[PDB]
Amino acid sequence: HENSNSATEGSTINYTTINYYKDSYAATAGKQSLKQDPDKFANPVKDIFTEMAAPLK
Amino acid sequence: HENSNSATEGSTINYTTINYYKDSYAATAGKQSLKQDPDKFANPVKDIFTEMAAPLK
Amino acid sequence: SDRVAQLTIGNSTITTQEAANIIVGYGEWPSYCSDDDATAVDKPTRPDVSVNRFYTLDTKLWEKSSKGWYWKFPDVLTETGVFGQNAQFHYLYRSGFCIHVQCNASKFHQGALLVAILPEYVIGTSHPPYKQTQPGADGFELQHPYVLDAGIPISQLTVCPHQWINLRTNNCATIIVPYMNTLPFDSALNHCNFGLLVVPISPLDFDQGATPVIPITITLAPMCSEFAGLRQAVTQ
Amino acid sequence: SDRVAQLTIGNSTITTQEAANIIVGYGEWPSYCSDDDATAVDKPTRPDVSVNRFYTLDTKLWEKSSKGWYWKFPDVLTETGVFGQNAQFHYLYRSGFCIHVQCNASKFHQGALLVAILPEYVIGTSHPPYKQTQPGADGFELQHPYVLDAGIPISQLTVCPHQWINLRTNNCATIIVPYMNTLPFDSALNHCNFGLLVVPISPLDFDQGATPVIPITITLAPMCSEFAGLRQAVTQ
Amino acid sequence: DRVADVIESSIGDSVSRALTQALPAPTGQNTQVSSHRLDTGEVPALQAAEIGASSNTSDESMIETRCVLNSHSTAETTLDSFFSRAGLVGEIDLPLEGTTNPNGYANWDIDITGYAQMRRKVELFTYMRFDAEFTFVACTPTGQVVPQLLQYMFVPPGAPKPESRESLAWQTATNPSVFVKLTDPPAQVSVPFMSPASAYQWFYDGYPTFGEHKQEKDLEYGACPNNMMGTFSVRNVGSSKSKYPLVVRIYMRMKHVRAWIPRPMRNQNYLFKANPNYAGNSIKPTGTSRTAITTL
Amino acid sequence: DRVADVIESSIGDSVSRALTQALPAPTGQNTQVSSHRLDTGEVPALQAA
Ligand SMILES: CCCCCCCCCCCC(=O)O
Ligand SMILES: [Ca+2]
Ligand SMILES: [Ca+2]
Ligand SMILES: [Ca+2]
Numbered sequence: 001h002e003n004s005n006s007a008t009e010g011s012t013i014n015y016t017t018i019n020y021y022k023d024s025y026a027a028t029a030g031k032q033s034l035k036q037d038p039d040k041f042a043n044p045v046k047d048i049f050t051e052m053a054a055p056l057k
Numbered sequence: 058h059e060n061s062n063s064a065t066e067g068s069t070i071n072y073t074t075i076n077y078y079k080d081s082y083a084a085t086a087g088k089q090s091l092k093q094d095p096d097k098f099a100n101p102v103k104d105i106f107t108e109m110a111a112p113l114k
Numbered sequence: 115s116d117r118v119a120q121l122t123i124g125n126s127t128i129t130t131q132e133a134a135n136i137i138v139g140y141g142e143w144p145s146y147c148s149d150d151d152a153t154a155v156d157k158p159t160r161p162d163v164s165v166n167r168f169y170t171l172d173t174k175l176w177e178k179s180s181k182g183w184y185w186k187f188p189d190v191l192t193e194t195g196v197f198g199q200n201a202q203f204h205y206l207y208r209s210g211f212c213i214h215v216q217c218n219a220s221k222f223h224q225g226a227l228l229v230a231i232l233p234e235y236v237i238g239t240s241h242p243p244y245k246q247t248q249p250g251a252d253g254f255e256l257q258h259p260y261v262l263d264a265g266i267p268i269s270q271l272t273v274c275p276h277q278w279i280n281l282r283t284n285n286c287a288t289i290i291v292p293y294m295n296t297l298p299f300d301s302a303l304n305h306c307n308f309g310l311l312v313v314p315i316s317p318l319d320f321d322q323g324a325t326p327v328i329p330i331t332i333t334l335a336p337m338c339s340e341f342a343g344l345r346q347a348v349t350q
Numbered sequence: 351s352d353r354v355a356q357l358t359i360g361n362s363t364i365t366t367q368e369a370a371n372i373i374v375g376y377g378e379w380p381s382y383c384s385d386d387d388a389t390a391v392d393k394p395t396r397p398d399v400s401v402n403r404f405y406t407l408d409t410k411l412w413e414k415s416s417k418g419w420y421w422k423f424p425d426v427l428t429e430t431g432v433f434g435q436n437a438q439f440h441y442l443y444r445s446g447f448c449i450h451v452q453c454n455a456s457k458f459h460q461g462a463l464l465v466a467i468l469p470e471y472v473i474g475t476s477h478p479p480y481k482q483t484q485p486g487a488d489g490f491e492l493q494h495p496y497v498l499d500a501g502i503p504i505s506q507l508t509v510c511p512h513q514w515i516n517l518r519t520n521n522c523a524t525i526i527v528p529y530m531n532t533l534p535f536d537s538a539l540n541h542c543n544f545g546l547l548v549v550p551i552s553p554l555d556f557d558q559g560a561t562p563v564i565p566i567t568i569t570l571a572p573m574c575s576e577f578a579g580l581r582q583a584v585t586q
Numbered sequence: 587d588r589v590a591d592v593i594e595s596s597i598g599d600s601v602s603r604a605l606t607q608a609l610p611a612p613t614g615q616n617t618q619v620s621s622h623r624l625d626t627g628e629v630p631a632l633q634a635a636e637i638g639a640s641s642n643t644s645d646e647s648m649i650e651t652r653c654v655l656n657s658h659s660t661a662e663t664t665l666d667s668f669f670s671r672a673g674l675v676g677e678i679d680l681p682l683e684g685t686t687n688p689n690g691y692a693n694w695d696i697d698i699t700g701y702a703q704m705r706r707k708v709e710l711f712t713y714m715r716f717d718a719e720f721t722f723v724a725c726t727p728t729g730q731v732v733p734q735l736l737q738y739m740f741v742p743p744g745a746p747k748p749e750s751r752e753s754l755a756w757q758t759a760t761n762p763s764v765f766v767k768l769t770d771p772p773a774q775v776s777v778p779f780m781s782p783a784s785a786y787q788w789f790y791d792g793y794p795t796f797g798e799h800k801q802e803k804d805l806e807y808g809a810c811p812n813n814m815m816g817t818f819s820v821r822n823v824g825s826s827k828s829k830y831p832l833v834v835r836i837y838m839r840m841k842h843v844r845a846w847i848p849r850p851m852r853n854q855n856y857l858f859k860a861n862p863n864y865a866g867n868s869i870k871p872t873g874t875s876r877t878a879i880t881t882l
Numbered sequence: 883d884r885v886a887d888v889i890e891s892s893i894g895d896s897v898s899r900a901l902t903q904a905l906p907a908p909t910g911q912n913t914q915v916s917s918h919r920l921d922t923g924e925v926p927a928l929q930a931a
């Protein structure tokens with residue numbers, strides 16, 4: 001039936017792979033879901049301003 | 058599930074191919090639909106006349 | 115209503131009148147450990163106020179030639195306050211920090227200080243000493259700021275929780291960082307989750323006559339402190 | 351939220367941090383020609399972005415003795431950018447302008463510049479030359495600012511789209527003017543709908559030591575540009 | 587019954603604040619039409635990086651833009667789509683003559699920081715969890731394909747490491763071994779994320795001993811046992827001499843990748859393995875230099 | 883069929899913005915009663931020509 005041991009286990013992304021063996025880690029990397037979050041690194045500020053507004057009030 | 062990257066992407070013709078990998082471009086050329094348009098090159102004239110009629114009126 | 119601000123933790127309070135807002139490390143607030151992420155089977159100690167408070171430690175002097183300095187959080191605080199004790203008595207440690215690097219001047223001075231956070235801050239040189247890897251209080255100084263003494267370009271450090279102290283605008287920076295490690299807990303006595311770097315990108319300058327004593331103080335505060343594996347008191 | 355401002359036209363953008371707001375000539379925005387006000391039977395050319403953009407042309411130096419300068423819009427822009435071409439190739443012209451005269455200084459400087467617009471700006475002296483009536487780029491200078499070189503009192507110029515650049519408050523002025531003429535269109539090669547005057551009413555002063563180089567730049571941008579009567583290229 | 591303080595106290599929140607959500611992004615952002623705008627109070631362009639945020643100014647608020655439908659996919663700029671590419675990380679030498687590897691066997695330490703190409707990419711992040719696929723290219727120093735048989739055996743940390751070309755350890759009754767001929771194609775192997783730590787650690791800012799950390803022991807600073815996967819052994823299956831000069835090259839590809847904290851790229855030339863030590867006597871600029879900042 | 887840019891473009895407005903309307907004014911403005919006023923934030927006199 002297969003095992004659940006492929007690092008990206010319980011991963012939020014949905015990977016559609018191909019595997020011939022019992023262990024899921026032997027499976028290919030396959031197609032994945034495309035999600036992003038430029039903010040966690042670009043705008044990790046507590047308060048948000050917006051372009052139209054002046055950064056420092 | 059596969060990717061959509063095979064040049065003839067969004068192509069009007071319907072190609073029925075075989076692919077074993079994730080990328081669709083690795084797929085064979087396979088069977089295609091037979092469409093033609095001899096006019097775009099033979100009769101690219103603005104106005105049409107017909108055989109029975111005289112070309113220059 | 116964006117420059118003024120106040121930070122209140124434990125029995126300490128910080129003030130500012132030229133702040134440039136607060137940045138949250140990777141957009142995430144310091145949280146405790148889940149009952150599934152932890153493997154340490156024993157209810158840890160969350161002293162809170164007694165350790166989760168503001169601690170003003172070292173201070174440095176900015177000059178027209180200063181290269182830069184750096185610290186190693188996990189270790190830095192140890193040996194001081196109630197926090198240090200738990201860190202020395204317990205084996206496992208866990209906590210996030212609120213850093214506040216203040217440095218004021220007059221409107222006639224000019225300068226730009228980059229204050230960023232760098233996780234797992236390892237250094238090179240063929241092996242640096244214990245006095246260089248864990249310079250707790252009073253930190254250490256950078257010799258080759260361009261490569262951060264690690265062989266990496268500083269021009270690419272903004273890719274981490276950072277902030278600037280441009281004397282012509284603000285006079286202090288503030289960062290908040292959650293616990294960071296491939297583990298739930300870890301002894302801070304021998305491992306530093308990250309380090310703080312303060313480097314002058316724009317050389318401090320000012321016409322003669324204006325008070326040349328421009329100090330830069332460091333004040334931090336633990337958050338969601340959790341300690342486990344209670345044992346004998348250790349130092350290193 | 352009244353001093354800061356941004357102007358975006360074509361592929362140009364202007365900034366300010368001490369603006370004193372924007373004035374609209376006679377309270378009216380630049381509009382195109384109605385199908386009844388026009389007599390030119392032929393669809394004109396509205397290039398838009400290619401001509402309706404910001405153009406930074408001349409710059410002058412303000413001094414404790416400067417008298418004043420002036421320009422003639424219709425003509426000024428010609429010979430420069432895509433705009434100039436349409437003005438030279440076409441016979442009929444039509445457009446409104448957005449003027450932005452910037453001039454900064456420090457809080458230790460003092461001065462007051464009057465920037466007003468004067469429709470059909472004719473001058474006297476017994477007949478001024480072509481180099482004085484249409485000093486396009488780099489404009490011309492006033493010799494008798496009190497009478498605006500036309501015999502009229504400057505003390506009564508505020509009766510037209512104007513604005514002030516008082517160094518102690520703002521550092522730039524901005525005006526918007528719609529097409530003005532007793533006709534729908536008119537060749538700008540030989541007729542200037544109006545002119546811009548910049549005169550120091552409060553002599554620029556400052557104690558020795560502070561950078562004495564106080565430049566005054568001129569930046570304008572066409573609006574609702576329409577050209578008709580396409581023909582051979584002409585210059586004057 | 588309650589001191590109230592105990593009721594209020596949020597102490598014990600395993601739930602992280604977040605405040606930032608990951609959204610779908612197959613095609614790059616599509617640009618939209620934008621007309622002119624002249625007004626006060628609105629300063630899109632004006633920013634203050636002094637805060638630590640990347641200017642959020644958009645093209646539209648800068649110039650009169652048009653409309654564009656970005657079909658450009660961002661599927662090749664993903665983790666797997668990047669790291670999942672075979673690369674040299676190991677290289678063993680079993681020559682006939684020499685002092686390097688006589689006897690016919692060789693114990694290689696499991697570490698990939700030995701080669702630039704791969705090491706550069708991986709050291710971009712601080713942590714990384716994933717599985718991998720290793721390929722083994724065995725061949726002579728010339729490219730000669732020889733009819734020799736070998737035995738690759740994995741030796742986990744704490745397991746008996748072979749000491750001779752015929753050490754008992756090669757019975758591999760428990761350990762995983764692979765026998766292949768140099769005539770057959772390279773070895774295909776899948777390896778799961780094995781480590782006490784939830785993710786491999788590229789940089790370890792601390793000591794694994796927890797002792798005095800004397801100078802002679804500064805050889806440990808940076809050494810993380812969570813990256814110690816033991817060793818890899820290889821030898822010829824025989825009692826006599828190999829009869830051939832061999833050289834095995836190990837290639838690796840990553841599957842199911844999970845990177846975390848990102849750090850600055852490498853600026854200097856790598857010197858040691860698992861050591862960020864750099865060429866201090868001669869440091870070079872991050873990039874090319876010019877003659878004047880006002881000249882191209 | 884439309885590049886969108888052509889749809890948005892306001893280019894071709896024969897209508898002037900105005901923003902200022904002419905109102906009746908037979909008699910000059912009539913003055914009204916006014917009591918004292920002492921407060922902050924209100925600066926009628928303070929202007930910026
Ligand atoms: C079985 C393959 C497992 C691959 C793990 C390689 C990790 C090597 C990292 C070495 C870093 C170090 O030792 O400090
Ligand atoms: Ca000190
Ligand atoms: Ca210490
Ligand atoms: Ca000039």
Ligand SMILES: [Ca+2]
Nearest residue numbers: 425484486586
């Ligand atoms: Ca001319």
